[PDB]
Design a protein around this motif. Structure first.
Motif, short mmCIF file in Angstrom:
data_model
loop_
_atom_site.label_atom_id
_atom_site.label_comp_id
_atom_site.label_asym_id
_atom_site.label_seq_id
_atom_site.Cartn_x
_atom_site.Cartn_y
_atom_site.Cartn_z
N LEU A 325 33.68 38.46 39.01
CA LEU A 325 32.35 38.94 39.48
C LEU A 325 31.79 40.08 38.65
O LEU A 325 30.57 40.22 38.51
CB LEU A 325 32.40 39.40 40.95
N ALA A 326 32.67 40.91 38.12
CA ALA A 326 32.28 42.00 37.26
C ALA A 326 31.59 41.44 35.97
O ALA A 326 30.43 41.77 35.67
CB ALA A 326 33.51 42.86 36.92
N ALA A 327 32.27 40.48 35.29
CA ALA A 327 31.83 39.87 34.06
C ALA A 327 30.68 38.87 34.23
O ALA A 327 29.85 38.75 33.32
CB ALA A 327 33.01 39.24 33.36
N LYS A 328 30.58 38.18 35.39
CA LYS A 328 29.46 37.26 35.62
C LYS A 328 28.12 38.05 35.69
O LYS A 328 27.13 37.67 35.05
CB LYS A 328 29.65 36.41 36.90
N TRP A 329 28.11 39.15 36.45
CA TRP A 329 26.89 39.95 36.59
C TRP A 329 26.69 41.01 35.49
O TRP A 329 25.72 41.77 35.56
CB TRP A 329 26.82 40.55 37.98
N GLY A 330 27.56 41.00 34.49
CA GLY A 330 27.47 41.85 33.32
C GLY A 330 27.61 43.34 33.51
O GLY A 330 27.05 44.09 32.71
N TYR A 331 28.37 43.78 34.53
CA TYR A 331 28.58 45.23 34.69
C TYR A 331 29.75 45.61 33.78
O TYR A 331 30.91 45.38 34.11
CB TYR A 331 28.85 45.64 36.15
N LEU A 332 29.43 46.15 32.61
CA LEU A 332 30.40 46.53 31.60
C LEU A 332 31.48 47.51 32.13
O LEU A 332 32.66 47.16 32.22
CB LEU A 332 29.65 47.14 30.40
N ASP A 357 34.76 33.28 30.20
CA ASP A 357 33.91 32.09 30.31
C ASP A 357 32.61 32.35 31.06
O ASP A 357 31.54 31.95 30.58
CB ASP A 357 34.68 30.91 30.92
N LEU A 358 32.68 33.06 32.21
CA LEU A 358 31.51 33.45 33.02
C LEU A 358 30.67 34.56 32.35
O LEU A 358 29.63 34.94 32.89
CB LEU A 358 31.94 33.93 34.41
N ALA A 359 31.13 35.12 31.23
CA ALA A 359 30.42 36.14 30.48
C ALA A 359 29.60 35.47 29.37
O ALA A 359 28.49 35.91 29.08
CB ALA A 359 31.42 37.12 29.89
N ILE A 360 30.13 34.42 28.72
CA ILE A 360 29.39 33.71 27.68
C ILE A 360 28.35 32.73 28.28
O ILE A 360 27.31 32.45 27.67
CB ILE A 360 30.39 33.04 26.69
N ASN A 362 26.58 33.37 31.00
CA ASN A 362 25.45 34.16 31.49
C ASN A 362 24.82 35.09 30.44
O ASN A 362 24.14 36.05 30.80
CB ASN A 362 25.84 34.96 32.75
N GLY A 363 25.04 34.79 29.16
CA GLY A 363 24.44 35.55 28.07
C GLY A 363 24.99 36.93 27.73
O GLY A 363 24.66 37.45 26.66
N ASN A 364 25.80 37.55 28.63
CA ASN A 364 26.43 38.88 28.48
C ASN A 364 27.37 38.95 27.26
O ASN A 364 28.59 38.81 27.39
CB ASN A 364 27.20 39.24 29.75
N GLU A 365 26.80 39.20 26.09
CA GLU A 365 27.55 39.18 24.84
C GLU A 365 28.37 40.42 24.57
O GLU A 365 29.26 40.36 23.72
CB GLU A 365 26.64 38.88 23.64
N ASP A 366 28.08 41.54 25.24
CA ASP A 366 28.87 42.75 25.03
C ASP A 366 30.11 42.66 25.89
O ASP A 366 31.22 42.80 25.39
CB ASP A 366 28.04 44.02 25.27
N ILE A 367 29.93 42.32 27.17
CA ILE A 367 31.00 42.12 28.15
C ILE A 367 32.05 41.13 27.62
O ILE A 367 33.22 41.48 27.51
CB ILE A 367 30.39 41.66 29.51
N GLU A 369 32.92 40.47 24.78
CA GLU A 369 33.64 41.04 23.65
C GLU A 369 34.67 42.06 24.13
O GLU A 369 35.81 42.05 23.67
CB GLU A 369 32.66 41.61 22.62
N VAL A 370 34.31 42.89 25.11
CA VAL A 370 35.27 43.82 25.71
C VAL A 370 36.10 43.07 26.79
O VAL A 370 36.32 43.56 27.90
CB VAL A 370 34.65 45.14 26.20
N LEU A 371 36.50 41.83 26.44
CA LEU A 371 37.34 40.93 27.21
C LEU A 371 38.31 40.29 26.22
O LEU A 371 39.51 40.31 26.47
CB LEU A 371 36.51 39.88 27.94
N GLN A 372 37.83 39.78 25.08
CA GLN A 372 38.74 39.22 24.05
C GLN A 372 39.39 40.32 23.19
O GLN A 372 40.37 40.06 22.49
CB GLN A 372 38.08 38.16 23.18
N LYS A 373 38.81 41.53 23.22
CA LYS A 373 39.36 42.70 22.55
C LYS A 373 40.35 43.29 23.56
O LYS A 373 41.50 43.53 23.21
CB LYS A 373 38.25 43.71 22.21
N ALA A 374 39.91 43.45 24.85
CA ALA A 374 40.69 43.99 25.96
C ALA A 374 41.54 42.91 26.66
O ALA A 374 41.45 42.73 27.88
CB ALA A 374 39.76 44.69 26.95
N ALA A 375 42.36 42.18 25.87
CA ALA A 375 43.32 41.17 26.30
C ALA A 375 44.52 41.15 25.32
O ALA A 375 44.99 42.25 24.94
CB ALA A 375 42.66 39.81 26.37
#
Ligand SMILES: Cc1cc2nc3c(=O)[nH]c(=O)nc-3n(C[C@H](O)[C@H](O)[C@H](O)COP(=O)(O)O)c2cc1C
Ligand SMILES: [Mg+2]
Length: 375
Positions: A325-332, A357-360, A362-367, A369-375
């Motif tokens: 839910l954090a990443a779907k609604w783009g709250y970094l 997946d729910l970040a790409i 919904n267009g949230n391109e920064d979020i 990235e701080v998911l594949q870096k933060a993994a």
């Protein structure tokens, strides 16, 4: 028009209209004086008309269809759209539709709150205003609900005088038992509204006079649920001193703590958990207060909830964790704080989706990235 609603809602002084879905084309049956000011049309030019007169050329026809869908599906909706006054003066409308339902849950009328802005507001300012119009429509509903109860009382009091004057004691005996339930229900709603509006002395007075501190409306709403939703620490504390159930659940499995996490009232959450609130209580959809904190952008509440036993990998009805839910609604800032406290990046929702997946999607391109870096 309608003289009943006119009397109850005459004191609100916010932009709002009520419409009759039972008449052709859902015509306006009550318009507030603030609406009349905002739009510039008179009460006579408004009543009996569908509210689409406010529409114009720069009005997003796609946002208008979201409102038709909500009316048709009899659900509430909060949208932002450009509207026009009688003169032609364009203005932004943060609009909120809310069906007025009876105790059986059937729609009777529609409430439409309008919050005029000079520009399309967004982020925390949009969330601050949306919470406020929602609270306005909640009060217009309760104002009509109370007025309806007052009317039933005066009506049975009238019947009592006639039956007393007719000799007929069998009728009075029978009428008084119905009145004794209208009085019973009136104070239950009087206390529900007192908590909603933050009227501390009304709360103390009704409880002092005998009001049940746990008396709920037909839907399961206790005064503690409304006090929590409003941000009224004193009323919350008063209700908890007077022995109110801190784990009360309404017809939707929502607890005072779910409403405290949704509304972003940090102080109330701490007091409710300090008094025995279930940090992992789940509503009919499977949302725990942690899911509501994550979806609404309440950074501060998540850190407090997890510290009391909240499962950071809680599954809603669709297998979604707070980290989803954090990443779907783009709250970094939320995804970072949630992942910090051991949240599963490879978590399977209903569709096997993970935060990335729910970040790409919904267009949230920064979020993303701080998911594949933060993994
Ligand atoms: C209570 C209520 C208030 C409304 N207020 C507004 C309003 O402020 N502005 C607006 O453009 N439409 C408003 N509408 C929505 C329109 O009346 C209408 O539903 C919308 O234009 C979609 O239907 P249509 O495509 O048939 O016009 C309101 C509707 C209701 C039920
Ligand atoms: Mg309509």
């Amino acid at each position: 028009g309608s003289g009943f609603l006119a009397a109850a809602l005459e004191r609100i002084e916010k932009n709002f209209v009520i419409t009759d879905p039972r008449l052709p084309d859902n015509p306006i049956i009550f318009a507030s004086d603030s609406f009349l000011q905002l739009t510039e049309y008179s009460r006579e030019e408004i009543l009996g008309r569908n509210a689409r007169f406010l529409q114009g050329p720069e009005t997003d026809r796609a946002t208008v269809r979201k409102i038709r869908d909500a009316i048709d599906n009899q659900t509430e909706v909060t949208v932002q759209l450009i509207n026009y006054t009688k003169s032609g003066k364009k203005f932004w409308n943060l609009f909120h539709l809310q069906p007025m339902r009876d105790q059986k849950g059937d729609v009777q009328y529609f409430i439409g709150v309008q919050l005029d802005g000079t520009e399309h507001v967004r982020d925390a300012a949009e969330r601050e205003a949306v919470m406020l119009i929602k609270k306005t429509a909640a009060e217009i509903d309760a104002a009509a609900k109370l007025a309806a109860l007052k009317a039933a009382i005066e009506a049975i009091i009238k019947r009592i005088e006639e039956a007393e004057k007719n000799g007929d004691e069998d009728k009075v005996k029978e009428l008084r038992e119905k009145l004794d339930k209208l009085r019973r229900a009136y104070l239950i709603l009087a206390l529900l509204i007192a908590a909603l509006k933050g009227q501390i002395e009304e709360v103390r007075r009704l409880l002092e006079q005998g009001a049940d501190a746990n008396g709920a409306d037909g839907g399961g709403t206790t005064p503690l649920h409304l006090a929590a939703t409003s941000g009224q620490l004193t009323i919350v504390e008063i209700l908890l001193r007077q022995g109110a159930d801190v784990n009360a659940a309404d017809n939707t499995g929502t607890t005072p703590l779910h409403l405290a996490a949704y509304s972003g009232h940090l102080e109330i959450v701490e007091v409710l958990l300090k008094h025995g609130a279930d940090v992992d209580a789940s509503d009919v959809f499977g949302y725990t207060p942690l899911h509501l904190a994550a979806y609404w952008g309440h950074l501060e509440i998540v850190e407090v909830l997890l510290k009391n036993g909240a499962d950071v990998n809680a599954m809603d009805s669709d297998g979604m964790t707070p980290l989803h839910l954090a990443a779907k609604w783009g709250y970094l800032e939320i995804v970072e704080v949630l992942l910090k406290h051991g949240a599963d990046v490879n978590a399977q929702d209903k569709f096997g989706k993970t935060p990335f997946d729910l970040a790409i999607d919904n267009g949230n391109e920064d979020i993303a990235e701080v998911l594949q870096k933060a993994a």
